[PDB]
Amino acid sequence: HMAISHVQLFSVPVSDQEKAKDFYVETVGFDLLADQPGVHGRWLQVAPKGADTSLVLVDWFPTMPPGSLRGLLLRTDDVDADCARLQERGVAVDGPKNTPWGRQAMFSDPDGNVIGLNQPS
Amino acid sequence: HMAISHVQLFSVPVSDQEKAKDFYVETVGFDLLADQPGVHGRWLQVAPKGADTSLVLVDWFPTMPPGSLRGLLLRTDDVDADCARLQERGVAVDGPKNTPWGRQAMFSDPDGNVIGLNQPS
If DSSP codes are grouped into helix, strand and coil, which group holds residue A41? Predict the structure, then answer.
Protein backbone atom coordinates (compact mmCIF):
# COMPACT_ATOMS: atom_id res chain seq x y z
CA HIS A 1 0.00 0.00 0.00
CA MET A 2 1.11 3.62 -0.78
CA ALA A 3 1.37 6.26 2.04
CA ILE A 4 -0.89 8.75 0.27
CA SER A 5 -3.68 9.89 2.61
CA HIS A 6 -5.79 12.32 0.58
CA VAL A 7 -5.77 14.96 -2.10
CA GLN A 8 -4.13 17.98 -0.46
CA LEU A 9 -5.31 20.41 -3.13
CA PHE A 10 -6.26 20.74 -6.76
CA SER A 11 -6.32 23.66 -9.17
CA VAL A 12 -9.14 25.76 -10.61
CA PRO A 13 -8.21 27.88 -13.64
CA VAL A 14 -9.20 31.52 -13.37
CA SER A 15 -8.36 34.83 -15.11
CA ASP A 16 -8.90 37.67 -12.68
CA GLN A 17 -7.70 36.25 -9.36
CA GLU A 18 -9.13 39.08 -7.30
CA LYS A 19 -12.63 38.49 -8.65
CA ALA A 20 -12.18 34.75 -8.19
CA LYS A 21 -11.00 35.19 -4.60
CA ASP A 22 -13.97 37.33 -3.76
CA PHE A 23 -16.34 34.85 -5.40
CA TYR A 24 -15.09 31.76 -3.59
CA VAL A 25 -14.68 33.48 -0.23
CA GLU A 26 -17.60 35.92 -0.09
CA THR A 27 -20.18 34.32 -2.37
CA VAL A 28 -19.52 30.61 -1.92
CA GLY A 29 -18.40 31.04 1.71
CA PHE A 30 -14.99 29.31 1.63
CA ASP A 31 -12.21 30.28 4.00
CA LEU A 32 -9.12 31.97 2.56
CA LEU A 33 -6.19 29.74 3.53
CA ALA A 34 -3.35 31.58 1.74
CA ASP A 35 -2.75 34.61 -0.47
CA GLN A 36 0.97 34.90 -1.04
CA PRO A 37 3.73 34.78 -3.63
CA GLY A 38 4.13 31.44 -5.42
CA VAL A 39 6.65 30.05 -7.92
CA HIS A 40 4.41 30.58 -10.98
CA GLY A 41 2.16 33.41 -9.82
CA ARG A 42 0.03 34.52 -6.89
CA TRP A 43 -0.82 31.54 -4.68
CA LEU A 44 -4.48 31.91 -3.70
CA GLN A 45 -5.86 28.96 -1.71
CA VAL A 46 -9.45 28.52 -0.48
CA ALA A 47 -11.52 25.74 1.09
CA PRO A 48 -14.68 25.04 3.04
CA LYS A 49 -13.97 25.48 6.75
CA GLY A 50 -12.54 22.32 8.24
CA ALA A 51 -12.08 20.44 4.92
CA ASP A 52 -9.05 18.29 4.14
CA THR A 53 -8.84 19.11 0.42
CA SER A 54 -8.43 22.71 -0.70
CA LEU A 55 -8.53 24.56 -4.04
CA VAL A 56 -5.91 26.82 -5.61
CA LEU A 57 -7.14 29.56 -7.97
CA VAL A 58 -4.45 29.50 -10.67
CA ASP A 59 -3.75 31.27 -13.95
CA TRP A 60 -0.49 29.66 -15.09
CA PHE A 61 -1.43 26.34 -16.77
CA PRO A 62 -1.87 26.78 -20.55
CA THR A 63 -3.61 23.40 -20.79
CA MET A 64 -6.27 24.65 -18.33
CA PRO A 65 -7.74 27.83 -19.83
CA PRO A 66 -9.66 30.12 -17.49
CA GLY A 67 -13.13 28.80 -16.86
CA SER A 68 -12.53 25.37 -18.44
CA LEU A 69 -13.07 23.19 -15.35
CA ARG A 70 -16.10 20.93 -15.08
CA GLY A 71 -17.12 18.05 -12.87
CA LEU A 72 -16.40 19.57 -9.47
CA LEU A 73 -18.97 18.59 -6.85
CA LEU A 74 -19.25 20.13 -3.39
CA ARG A 75 -20.99 18.28 -0.59
CA THR A 76 -23.55 20.36 1.28
CA ASP A 77 -25.76 19.70 4.27
CA ASP A 78 -28.50 21.97 2.84
CA VAL A 79 -28.60 22.29 -0.92
CA ASP A 80 -31.95 24.14 -0.94
CA ALA A 81 -30.79 26.86 1.47
CA ASP A 82 -27.43 27.13 -0.28
CA CYS A 83 -29.06 27.65 -3.68
CA ALA A 84 -31.32 30.39 -2.26
CA ARG A 85 -28.26 32.09 -0.77
CA LEU A 86 -26.46 31.89 -4.08
CA GLN A 87 -29.48 33.36 -5.88
CA GLU A 88 -29.66 36.20 -3.37
CA ARG A 89 -25.97 36.86 -4.12
CA GLY A 90 -26.68 37.15 -7.85
CA VAL A 91 -25.64 33.63 -8.96
CA ALA A 92 -27.64 31.80 -11.61
CA VAL A 93 -28.39 28.33 -10.27
CA ASP A 94 -29.60 25.33 -12.29
CA GLY A 95 -31.69 23.25 -9.93
CA PRO A 96 -31.83 21.93 -7.40
CA LYS A 97 -33.05 18.67 -8.92
CA ASN A 98 -33.45 15.26 -7.39
CA THR A 99 -31.16 12.55 -8.76
CA PRO A 100 -30.46 8.91 -7.87
CA TRP A 101 -27.27 10.01 -5.99
CA GLY A 102 -28.59 13.09 -4.05
CA ARG A 103 -30.32 16.46 -4.66
CA GLN A 104 -28.02 18.53 -6.82
CA ALA A 105 -27.61 21.95 -8.30
CA MET A 106 -25.09 23.57 -10.62
CA PHE A 107 -23.70 27.08 -10.96
CA SER A 108 -20.69 28.79 -12.53
CA ASP A 109 -17.88 30.89 -11.15
CA PRO A 110 -16.89 34.25 -12.76
CA ASP A 111 -14.75 32.54 -15.41
CA GLY A 112 -17.29 29.84 -16.27
CA ASN A 113 -15.89 26.92 -14.26
CA VAL A 114 -18.92 24.78 -13.39
CA ILE A 115 -19.49 23.88 -9.73
CA GLY A 116 -22.01 21.35 -8.44
CA LEU A 117 -23.68 21.10 -5.06
CA ASN A 118 -24.84 17.75 -3.75
CA GLN A 119 -26.85 16.85 -0.71
CA PRO A 120 -27.03 13.04 -0.50
CA SER A 121 -30.43 11.37 0.14
CA HIS B 1 -23.62 30.87 6.34
CA MET B 2 -23.28 28.37 3.45
CA ALA B 3 -23.76 24.68 4.38
CA ILE B 4 -20.98 23.32 2.14
CA SER B 5 -18.75 20.91 4.10
CA HIS B 6 -16.10 19.74 1.60
CA VAL B 7 -15.32 18.93 -2.00
CA GLN B 8 -17.06 15.61 -2.66
CA LEU B 9 -15.19 14.94 -5.90
CA PHE B 10 -13.48 16.51 -8.86
CA SER B 11 -12.73 15.30 -12.37
CA VAL B 12 -9.60 14.15 -14.13
CA PRO B 13 -9.76 14.03 -17.96
CA VAL B 14 -8.59 10.76 -19.47
CA SER B 15 -8.84 8.96 -22.83
CA ASP B 16 -8.66 5.19 -22.29
CA GLN B 17 -10.63 4.78 -19.06
CA GLU B 18 -9.62 1.15 -18.56
CA LYS B 19 -5.94 2.11 -18.72
CA ALA B 20 -6.58 5.06 -16.39
CA LYS B 21 -8.40 2.75 -13.94
CA ASP B 22 -5.49 0.40 -13.78
CA PHE B 23 -3.01 3.23 -13.35
CA TYR B 24 -4.85 4.92 -10.46
CA VAL B 25 -5.92 1.71 -8.69
CA GLU B 26 -2.98 -0.66 -9.30
CA THR B 27 -0.04 1.69 -9.82
CA VAL B 28 -0.94 4.64 -7.59
CA GLY B 29 -2.81 2.42 -5.12
CA PHE B 30 -6.16 4.26 -4.89
CA ASP B 31 -9.33 2.47 -3.89
CA LEU B 32 -11.91 1.89 -6.63
CA LEU B 33 -15.07 3.46 -5.25
CA ALA B 34 -17.38 2.94 -8.21
CA ASP B 35 -17.39 1.73 -11.79
CA GLN B 36 -20.86 1.97 -13.29
CA PRO B 37 -22.93 3.69 -15.99
CA GLY B 38 -23.29 7.45 -15.55
CA VAL B 39 -25.31 10.20 -17.20
CA HIS B 40 -22.46 11.10 -19.61
CA GLY B 41 -20.42 7.90 -19.89
CA ARG B 42 -18.71 5.33 -17.73
CA TRP B 43 -18.52 6.64 -14.14
CA LEU B 44 -15.15 5.56 -12.75
CA GLN B 45 -14.40 6.94 -9.29
CA VAL B 46 -11.24 6.42 -7.21
CA ALA B 47 -9.76 7.79 -4.00
CA PRO B 48 -7.02 7.27 -1.45
CA LYS B 49 -8.57 4.81 1.01
CA GLY B 50 -10.76 6.60 3.53
CA ALA B 51 -10.47 10.06 1.97
CA ASP B 52 -13.36 12.49 1.84
CA THR B 53 -12.63 13.87 -1.63
CA SER B 54 -12.54 11.48 -4.57
CA LEU B 55 -11.60 11.67 -8.28
CA VAL B 56 -13.72 10.79 -11.28
CA LEU B 57 -11.82 9.66 -14.40
CA VAL B 58 -13.93 11.30 -17.12
CA ASP B 59 -13.86 11.61 -20.89
CA TRP B 60 -16.92 13.78 -21.59
CA PHE B 61 -15.85 17.41 -21.01
CA PRO B 62 -14.65 19.10 -24.25
CA THR B 63 -13.11 21.94 -22.30
CA MET B 64 -10.89 19.37 -20.42
CA PRO B 65 -8.91 17.47 -23.06
CA PRO B 66 -7.39 14.16 -21.99
CA GLY B 67 -4.19 14.69 -20.07
CA SER B 68 -4.68 18.45 -19.60
CA LEU B 69 -4.90 18.55 -15.82
CA ARG B 70 -2.14 20.16 -13.74
CA GLY B 71 -1.75 21.33 -10.17
CA LEU B 72 -3.12 18.27 -8.36
CA LEU B 73 -1.21 17.57 -5.10
CA LEU B 74 -1.61 14.41 -3.04
CA ARG B 75 -0.65 14.46 0.63
CA THR B 76 1.55 11.55 1.69
CA ASP B 77 2.96 10.42 5.01
CA ASP B 78 6.14 9.11 3.24
CA VAL B 79 7.07 10.80 -0.02
CA ASP B 80 10.47 9.02 -0.28
CA ALA B 81 8.91 5.58 0.05
CA ASP B 82 6.10 6.48 -2.37
CA CYS B 83 8.58 7.69 -5.00
CA ALA B 84 10.60 4.49 -4.62
CA ARG B 85 7.38 2.50 -5.06
CA LEU B 86 6.34 4.40 -8.20
CA GLN B 87 9.82 3.90 -9.70
CA GLU B 88 9.62 0.16 -8.94
CA ARG B 89 6.23 0.12 -10.65
CA GLY B 90 7.58 1.63 -13.86
CA VAL B 91 6.71 5.31 -13.39
CA ALA B 92 9.01 8.25 -13.99
CA VAL B 93 9.23 10.45 -10.88
CA ASP B 94 10.77 13.90 -10.69
CA GLY B 95 12.05 14.31 -7.12
CA PRO B 96 11.54 13.98 -4.30
CA LYS B 97 13.03 17.35 -3.41
CA ASN B 98 12.55 19.68 -0.44
CA THR B 99 10.37 22.81 -1.06
CA PRO B 100 8.78 25.71 1.04
CA TRP B 101 5.32 24.05 0.88
CA GLY B 102 6.88 20.62 1.73
CA ARG B 103 8.98 17.74 0.22
CA GLN B 104 7.48 17.09 -3.16
CA ALA B 105 7.66 14.91 -6.25
CA MET B 106 5.83 14.91 -9.58
CA PHE B 107 4.72 12.20 -12.02
CA SER B 108 2.19 11.81 -14.80
CA ASP B 109 -0.66 9.47 -15.64
CA PRO B 110 -1.02 7.67 -19.01
CA ASP B 111 -2.63 10.71 -20.64
CA GLY B 112 -0.16 13.21 -19.23
CA ASN B 113 -2.18 14.64 -16.32
CA VAL B 114 0.45 15.79 -13.79
CA ILE B 115 0.17 14.56 -10.24
CA GLY B 116 2.20 15.82 -7.28
CA LEU B 117 3.10 14.18 -4.00
CA ASN B 118 3.75 16.24 -0.89
CA GLN B 119 4.92 15.29 2.59
CA PRO B 120 4.57 18.45 4.71
CA SER B 121 7.26 19.45 7.23
Answer: coil
